[PDB]
Design a protein around this ligand. Structure first.
Ligand SMILES: Nc1ncnc2c1ncn2[C@@H]1O[C@H](COP(=O)(O)OP(=O)(O)OP(O)(O)=S)[C@@H](O)[C@H]1O
Ligand SMILES: Nc1ncnc2c1ncn2[C@@H]1O[C@H](COP(=O)(O)OP(=O)(O)O)[C@@H](O)[C@H]1O
Ligand SMILES: [Mg+2]
Ligand SMILES: [Mg+2]
Lengths: 257, 614, 319
DNA sequence: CTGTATTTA
DNA sequence: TAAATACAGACCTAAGTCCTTGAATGCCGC
DNA sequence: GCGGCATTCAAGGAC
C-alpha cells in the first residue's frame, strides 16, 4: 500500500507537463527514498529521468518498492481536472491494478477521487552512471527556451559549440542560418539570471531541434537549467527541484569527419 | 472402395496423375498418394516412377511419357500397386527412409534442446514471469537464432552480408558494390507473402550483428509530418540505450548506430501527401542502416522504392524445411503427427508458417492426433481464400477443363464470377488481350477458331458497352455482375482451351497512355497553328500533317542545308516551334515513319537548323 | 400499451456454449479452449443468423468469469473502423494492466469485422503482434475476403456453415417447450423452409407468427411470411412453355407488387446459381437477363420488358 | 502460360 | 547440370457519391 | 502570444 500526499497538485501537474510530449509510457518506481521514473523515447534518442524525494510530499508511505506503468496522456487528463489550491494524494493498494488520485480542497470539503488504470511496460531497468563531463554550465531556462524556439524555425539540427568560454548555438537550414553567441557573466544583486559556467575542453556537438523543444517544454520546474556536455556521451539537461530533479539524456548527432 | 495398403507402401515413388479419373478426384488421388508416402509432382520428369493415366489426358503428356519410356498405369494398376507393394517401400526407398530418419532425429534433437531451455528457465526462476502455456505456439516457438529459420537461407545470408558490410560501404560512400552486389544501396527491402519469417529474420540479423534495433510500423504511423518527426531526427543521431547498456568492453564500434526496421511498408498512404515518397527520399540520405519489410512489393504506391534500395525476396518455404519444425513442435506438445500430411498442410496454407502453427495450436485442443482420415475437413475449413493475381485469373479463366461438364460441376459459374470479382479492373483487359492466343478445346462440332474468336469479340464489345454504362453517370454499379459475364466469362468460354504461348499482360494501358500523350501534343500543335489553319484537331491531323511533313522535312532531304531559311519562314508563318517540329514528325505511321529519316539527315543540317531556331 | 417484452432472439439467446446447436466440431473446440484457456486469435465467418456473435460472446463470458466487464473490449467494427480508434483506444486497452487468472487473457471482440477500413486493418497487425501475450483478438465477419491476408495470417479461421434442418428443428422445439406454444409439424417445416438455415430469422418468424395468429400452422406461416422470393423466379425461368412462365410472372410476381428491378436481379442470381441446365445455356440466359436489366435500369421497367425476357429465354431453350 | 531465380539432386 | 517448384510478368483514366483521414484552417480560451 | 481543440476540406480509395 502507498499513500503519498503532495503540497500542491500543480507541482505534479507541471512535472507531468514537462516530459509529456517526448515520452508516452513511464514506469514510476516507488521506494522508501521516494519516486524514480526513467523512460526511453519512442525513437530511443532522448532518455527522461525524474527523481522526487520524500521531502517533496506532505505525507509519504511505502511498504514495498512498487512499479506503476502510467500513460502520460491519461495522467495529464486526470491532473487537468484539479485546481491550484488542492492537495493531491496518490493511493495504491495491494496487487496494483489502478492508482487513485484524491484532490482535496482546503477551503471546502469537496473531494474529487479519480482512478487511473495501470499499464504493462516491459522495459528493462538500466543504470544512469554519473561520469565527469567536459563542460558544465547553468543559465536561465527562459533564455534557453527562447533560443531553441527561435532557432528551430530554420532547421531541425542544432550545433552546440563551447569554445574559448563562448557558447555558440548554430542552426543551418534550407533558408539561411542562425547563430547565437553567449558570454557567461556573474550579476551580483540577483544570481538567478546569472550564467555559471565551467569549461575544461571545448566541445562541439549537434542535437535535434525537436528533442530540444521537448526538453525546453519543461521550463517551469526551475529558473535555470544545468547543461552538461560530453563529446562521447549524451548531454545532460537538468531541471532541479526542491527535493528531486528532471534530467534529459540527449544523444548527439554523428560528428562525421 | 480402396484397399487398405501397408503403411508407407508407396514410399520412395514419384507419381504424376494425368487426365480425369472417374472414381477418385485428382486432388483426392493426390492426397491418397501422399498418404502412403508417395511423392507427387505435377510435371512428368525423368525421376518419375509411375504415371497414372486417365481419360482425356493431354497429348503432350503422352508424348513425354513415350520419350521417357515411363510405365503408364490405369485405375486398376493403381489399385494393384496400392494392394501389393510391401510396407515401408520394401533404390529411392532407402534414400527416403534415410531422409525420414534424419528428420525424426533432428526433431528429437531440438525437442531435447527446447526442454533443456525450459529447465534452465525454471532454474533461473528458482534462483530469483509469463506462464509458458499462456503464450501462443507462434511466439513460444519463435526462432531464437538464425539456425532455426526454415527456408529462404539465401535471402537471409544476403541480408546478413548486406548489413555486415554496411559500415565498410559507408566508409567508401557506397561506391564499391562488391562481389555480392550489396553495398551501393544504403537501404534494404524485404518482400514476400505474410508469415514466412521476414520480420523475424530482420530482427535476428539486427540483434546478432550488434546494431541497436529501432522498429516503427509504417501502417501505424503513416504521415509525412509523423515520418519527419520520428525518423528525420533519428537518421543521424546516436542511441542512448546503446551507450548506457554497454560501452566499456570491446564488443563492436557500431553499437551507437541505429538499424531502423520499418514493417508494413505497403500499409502507408499513397500520392504526394503520403509518407511513401518521404520514406523513399529517406532511403537516399541516411547515416544508419534502413531495413524495410513489406508484403506486396509491386504496387503503384510502392513504385518509388523500385530502384532506390536493394530488394530481397522471401519466397514460400519448402515443405522439407518445415517438416522438421512441425515435427519438433509436435513432439514438444505431445500430439501425434505423421509427416505424410505436412506437404498437404503446406499446399493449402500457401506457405504461411504462422498460419500452420496457428492451425496446429487450434486443432490439437480437440483432436490430440491428426491423421490422413480427417485431413479433408481440416483443409476444407482452412482454405486460403486470397484474391488471385490478374495473371493467375487470366490463366484460370482461359482453362479448357474448367468449362467441361466435370469442370462446370466442380468450378461453378458463381466461382467464375468470384474469380472475375477478385480483380475487376484488369480481368476484362487481360481477357481481351489474350483470348485469341489460346488453342481451343471446347469448339462446337462444325465451329472453327475464327468463329469462336468472333463471338468472343462480339461479347467483348457488349461487355465494353456495359462497362461504359457502369463507369459513367448514374453509377450503374449494380450491373457489375453483368460485366462479369459479358467481358470475361463468356469470351473465355467461347475460346477456352490450352495456352498456346505466354499470357501477355494487357497492352491497352500503354497504348492508351501513348495515345493520350500524342493527343496532348496534337492539342498544343493545333492551338499554336489555329491562327492559320482554322481547322479542328482531327481535321488538322488527318490532312494538314501529310503536307506539313513535306513542307518541313522534305526540303532537308532534297536540298541540303540551304533550305533552313524556307523551313524557318514556313514554321514562323504558323507559329511553329522546335518542340512542335519534333512532335510533328512523330505522328506519321505506315510507309511514312520518320524515326529513321531524321537520322539519315546529315548532322550538320540539324545543327544549322537548331542554331537558326535559337 | 406501456411496454413490450423481450424478443425470443434476445430472451432465448444462449449464454453457454452447450446451448448452441451450431457446428458441433467448432463448438466443441471452443468449449475445450474455454475449459483449458489460452484462447488464440480467431476470425469466425459465415452467413447471418447461425451463431457467430453468440458463440464469441459466450466464449468470452465463460473464459473471463466475473472479469468480463474489465477484460472484454467489444466494439462493432463497422461502428468504430477508424485507424485512430486502433491507434488510441485498442492500443490503450492492449497495454492496460489487469491481474487475471494464469490461463485467461483480455479479449478484444470486433463485431462486423468485414467493414473495417484498410488503414485500421493494417494498423491492427503490430498492435496484435506486440501485445499477443496479454490481449487476444476475435473477429466476427460474414466475408473472410474483406479481411486482409496478413490479418488472417495471425489467427485461427473458423468457417461456420449453414445450420442443418435437424439443429434448427431441435432449437425451435426447445423454444416451444419453454414458451408453451401451440404448434403443428407442417408449421415448423414451413418455418424451417423459409428460414434457409438462418436461426435468427426462424426464431423471429416463429415469434411473429405466435404473436399474430397464436397457432403455428403452415397456412398461418405462409400467410404472414411469404415463400422465398427466388424460388418463384426459379420456377418461372424453368417453365417448359412460354404461357406458363408468363402466367407465373403476371400472377405471382407482377400482380403481387414485386418491382421489375427486383425480378431481374433475382433472375440473374437464380441463373447464376442454377445447375439444371448446361453452362452455355446459363451464360446465354444471363446475357439476355443482363440486357433486360440494362433496359430496366434506364427507367424502362415495365411488364413488357420482363415478358420479352421470358420470351427470349424460351426461344433460347427452343434449340 | 514462358521465363527466370533458387534450391537440391 | 540437371529436377522441382515457386512465381513473376503489370496497375487506367475521365466520371458519381460516400467514406476515411491526414492536415491545414479557424476560432476560442488562457 | 501561444496552446489547445474543433471544424472543414482535400486526397485517395471503394462500390
Ligand atoms: N522460417 C520460419 N521458421 C520458424 N518459424 C517461423 C518462420 N517464419 C515464421 N515463423 C513463425 O511465425 C511467426 C511470425 O513470423 P513473422 O516474421 O512475423 O511473419 P512475417 O514473414 O513477417 O509476415 P508479416 O508479419 O505478415 S509482414 C514467428 O514468430 C514464428 O513463430
Ligand atoms: N446455433 C444456434 N443455436 C441457438 N441459437 C442460435 C444459433 N444461431 C443463432 N441463434 C440465435 O440467433 C440470435 C442471434 O444470432 P447471432 O449469433 O447474432 O447471428 P450471427 O451468427 O449472424 O451473428 C441469438 O439470440 C440466438 O438465440
Ligand atoms: Mg512482419
Ligand atoms: Mg452478428
Amino acid at each position: 500500500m502507498l499513500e503519498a500526499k503532495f503540497e500542491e497538485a500543480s507541482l505534479f501537474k507541471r512535472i507531468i507537463d514537462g516530459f509529456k510530449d517526448c515520452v508516452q509510457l513511464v514506469n514510476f518506481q516507488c521506494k522508501e527514498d521516494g519516486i524514480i521514473a526513467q523512460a526511453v523515447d519512442d525513437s530511443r534518442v532522448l532518455l527522461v529521468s525524474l527523481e522526487i524525494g520524500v521531502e517533496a510530499f506532505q505525507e509519504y508511505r511505502c511498504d514495498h518498492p512498487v512499479t506503476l506503468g502510467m500513460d502520460l496522456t491519461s495522467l495529464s487528463k486526470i491532473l487537468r481536472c484539479g485546481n491550484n489550491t488542492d492537495t493531491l494524494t496518490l493511493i495504491a493498494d495491494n496487487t496494483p491494478d489502478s492508482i487513485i488520485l484524491l484532490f482535496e480542497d482546503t477551503k471546502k470539503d469537496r473531494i474529487a477521487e479519480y482512478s487511473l488504470k495501470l499499464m504493462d511496460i516491459d522495459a528493462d531497468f538500466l543504470k544512469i552512471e554519473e561520469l565527469q563531463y567536459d563542460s558544465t554550465l547553468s543559465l536561465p531556462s527562459s533564455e534557453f527556451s527562447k533560443i531553441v524556439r527561435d532557432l528551430s524555425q530554420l532547421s531541425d539540427s542544432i550545433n552546440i559549440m563551447i569554445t574559448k568560454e563562448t557558447i555558440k548555438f548554430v542552426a543551418d537550414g534550407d533558408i539561411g542560418s542562425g547563430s547565437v553567441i553567449i558570454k557567461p557573466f556573474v550579476d551580483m544583486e540577483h544570481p538567478e539570471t546569472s550564467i555559471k559556467l565551467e569549461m575544461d575542453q571545448p566541445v562541439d556537438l549537434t542535437f535535434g531541434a525537436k528533442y530540444l523543444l521537448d526538453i525546453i517544454k519543461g521550463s517551469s520546474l526551475s529558473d535555470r537549467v544545468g547543461i552538461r556536455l560530453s563529446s562521447e556521451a549524451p548531454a545532460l539537461f537538468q531541471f532541479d527541484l526542491k527535493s528531486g530533479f528532471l534530467q534529459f539524456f540527449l544523444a548527439p548527432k554523428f560528428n562525421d569527419e | 472402395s480402396f484397399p487398405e495398403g501397408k503403411p508407407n507402401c508407396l514410399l520412395g515413388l514419384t507419381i504424376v496423375f494425368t487426365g480425369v479419373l472417374p472414381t477418385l478426384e485428382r486432388g483426392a488421388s493426390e492426397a491418397l498418394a501422399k498418404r502412403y508416402g508417395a511423392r507427387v509432382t505435377k510435371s512428368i520428369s525423368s525421376k518419375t516412377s509411375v504415371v497414372v493415366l486417365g481419360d482425356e489426358a493431354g497429348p503432350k503428356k503422352l508424348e513425354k511419357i513415350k520419350q521417357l519410356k515411363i510405365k503408364a498405369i490405369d485405375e486398376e494398376g493403381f489399385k494393384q500397386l496400392i494392394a501389393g507393394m510391401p510396407a515401408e517401400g520394401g533404390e529411392a526407398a532407402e534414400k527416403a527412409r534415410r531422409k525420414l530418419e534424419e528428420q525424426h532425429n533432428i526433431a528429437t534433437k531440438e525437442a531435447e534442446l527446447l526442454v533443456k531451455k525450459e529447465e534452465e528457465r525454471s532454474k533461473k526462476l528458482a534462483a530469483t514471469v509469463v506462464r509458458e502455456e499462456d503464450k501462443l505456439w507462434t511466439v513460444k516457438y519463435a526462432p531464437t537464432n538464425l539456425q532455426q529459420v526454415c527456408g529462404n537461407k539465401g535471402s537471409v545470408m544476403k541480408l546478413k552480408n548486406w548489413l555486415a558490410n554496411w559500415e565498410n560501404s559507408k566508409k567508401n560512400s557506397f561506391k564499391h558494390a562488391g562481389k555480392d552486389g550489396s553495398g551501393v544501396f544504403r537501404a534494404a527491402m524485404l518482400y514476400g507473402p505474410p508469415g514466412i519469417g521476414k520480420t523475424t529474420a530482420a530482427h535476428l540479423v539486427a540483434q546478432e550483428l550488434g546494431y541497436d534495433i529501432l522498429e516503427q510500423n509504417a501502417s501505424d504511423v503513416r504521415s509525412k509530418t509523423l515520418l519527419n518527426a520520428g525518423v528525420k531526427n533519428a537518421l543521424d543521431n546516436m542511441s542512448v540505450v546503446g551507450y548506457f547498456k554497454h560501452n566499456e568492453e570491446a564488443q563492436n564500434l557500431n553499437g551507437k548506430h541505429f538499424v531502423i526496421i520499418m514493417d508494413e511498408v505497403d500499409g502507408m498512404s499513397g500520392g504526394d501527401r503520403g509518407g511513401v515518397g518521404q520514406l523513399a527520399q529517406f532511403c537516399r540520405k541516411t547515416s544508419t542502416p534502413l531495413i524495410l519489410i513489406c508484403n506486396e512489393r509491386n504496387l503503384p504506391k510502392m513504385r518509388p522504392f523500385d530502384r532506390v534500395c536493394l530488394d530481397i525476396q522471401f519466397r514460400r518455404p519448402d515443405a522439407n524445411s518445415i517438416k522438421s519444425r512441425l515435427m519438433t513442435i509436435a513432439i514438444r506438445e505431445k500430439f501425434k503427427l505423421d509427416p505424410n500430411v505436412i506437404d498437404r498442410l503446406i499446399q493449402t496454407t500457401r506457405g504461411d508458417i504462422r498460419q500452420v502453427i496457428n492451425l496446429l495450436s487450434t486443432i490439437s485442443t480437440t483432436t490430440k492426433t491428426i491423421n490422413h482420415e480427417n485431413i479433408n475437413e481440416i483443409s476444407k475449413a482452412w482454405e486460403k481464400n486470397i484474391a488471385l493475381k490478374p495473371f493467375d485469373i487470366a490463366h484460370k479463366m482461359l482453362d479448357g477443363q474448367i468449362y467441361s461438364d466435370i469442370g462446370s460441376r466442380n468450378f461453378t459459374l458463381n466461382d467464375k464470377i468470384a474469380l472475375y470479382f477478385d480483380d475487376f479492373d484488369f480481368t476484362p483487359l487481360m481477357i481481351q488481350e489474350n483470348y485469341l492466343s489460346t488453342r481451343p478445346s471446347v469448339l462446337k462440332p462444325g465451329q472453327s477458331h475464327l468463329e469462336a474468336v468472333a463471338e468472343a469479340a462480339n461479347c467483348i464489345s457488349l461487355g465494353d458497352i456495359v462497362e461504359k454504362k457502369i463507369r459513367s453517370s448514374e453509377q450503374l454499379w449494380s450491373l457489375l455482375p453483368l460485366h462479369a459475364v459479358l467481358s470475361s466469362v463468356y469470351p473465355a468460354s467461347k475460346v477456352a482451351g490450352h495456352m498456346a504461348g505466354r499470357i501477355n499482360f494487357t497492352a491497352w494501358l500503354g497504348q492508351n497512355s501513348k495515345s493520350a500523350k500524342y493527343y496532348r501534343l496534337l492539342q498544343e500543335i493545333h492551338y499554336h497553328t489555329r491562327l492559320g489553319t482554322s481547322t479542328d484537331k482531327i481535321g488538322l491531323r488527318l490532312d494538314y500533317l501529310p503536307t506539313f511533313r513535306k513542307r518541313l522535312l522534305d526540303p532537308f532531304l532534297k536540298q541540303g542545308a540551304d533550305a533552313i531559311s524556307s523551313v524557318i519562314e514556313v514554321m514562323d508563318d504558323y507559329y511553329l516551334t522546335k518542340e512542335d517540329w519534333d512532335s510533328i514528325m512523330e505522328f506519321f505511321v505506315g510507309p511514312d515513319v520518320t524515326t529513321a529519316i531524321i537520322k539519315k539527315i546529315p548532322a550538320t543540317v540539324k545543327s544549322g537548323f537548331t542554331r537558326k531556331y535559337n | 400499451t406501456l411496454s413490450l417484452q423481450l424478443p425470443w432472439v434476445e430472451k432465448y439467446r444462449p449464454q453457454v456454449l452447450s446451448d448452441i446447436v451450431g457446428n458441433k466440431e467448432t463448438i466443441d473446440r471452443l468449449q475445450q479452449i474455454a475449459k483449458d484457456g489460452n484462447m488464440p486469435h480467431m476470425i469466425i465467418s459465415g452467413m447471418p443468423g447461425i451463431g457467430k456473435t453468440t458463440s464469441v460472446h459466450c466464449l468470452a463470458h465463460e473464459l473471463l468469469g466475473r472479469s468480463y466487464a474489465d477484460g472484454v473490449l467489444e466494439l462493432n467494427a463497422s461502428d468504430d473502423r477508424g485507424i485512430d480508434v486502433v491507434r488510441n483506444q485498442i492500443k490503450h486497452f492492449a497495454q492496460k494492466k489487469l491481474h487475471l487468472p494464469p490461463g485467461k487473457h483480455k479479449i478484444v471482440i470486433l463485431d462486423e469485422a468485414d467493414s473495417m477500413t484498410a488503414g485500421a486493418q493494417q494498423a491492427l497487425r503490430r498492435t496484435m503482434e506486440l501485445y499477443s501475450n496479454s490481449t487476444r483478438f476475435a473477429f466476427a465477419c460474414n466475408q473472410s475476403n474483406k479481411i486482409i491476408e496478413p490479418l488472417q495470417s495471425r489467427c485461427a479461421i473458423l468457417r461456420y456453415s449453414k445450420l442443418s434442418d435437424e439443429d434448427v428443428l431441435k432449437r425451435l422445439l426447445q423454444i416451444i417447450k419453454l414458451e408453451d406454444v401451440k404448434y403443428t409439424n407442417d408449421g415448423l417445416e414451413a418455418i424451417i423452409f423459409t428460414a434457409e438455415g438462418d436461426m435468427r430469422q426462424a426464431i423471429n418468424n416463429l415469434q411473429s407468427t405466435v404473436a399474430g395468429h397464436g397457432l403455428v400452422n403452415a397456412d398461418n406461416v405462409f400467410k404472414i411470411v411469404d415463400s422465398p422470393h427466388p424460388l418463384i423466379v426459379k420456377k418461372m425461368l424453368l417453365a417448359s412453355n412460354l404461357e406458363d412462365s408468363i402466367q407465373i410472372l403476371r400472377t405471382d410476381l407482377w400482380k403481387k407488387g414485386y418491382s421489375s428491378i427486383d425480378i431481374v436481379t433475382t433472375s440473374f442470381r437464380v441463373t447464376k446459381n442454377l445447375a439444371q441446365v448446361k453452362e452455355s445455356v446459363r451464360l446465354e440466359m444471363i446475357k439476355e437477363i443482363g440486357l433486360t436489366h440494362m433496359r430496366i435500369l434506364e427507367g424502362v421497367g415495365t411488364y413488357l420488358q420482363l415478358a420479352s425476357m421470358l420470351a427470349k429465354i424460351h426461344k433460347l431453350n427452343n434449340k
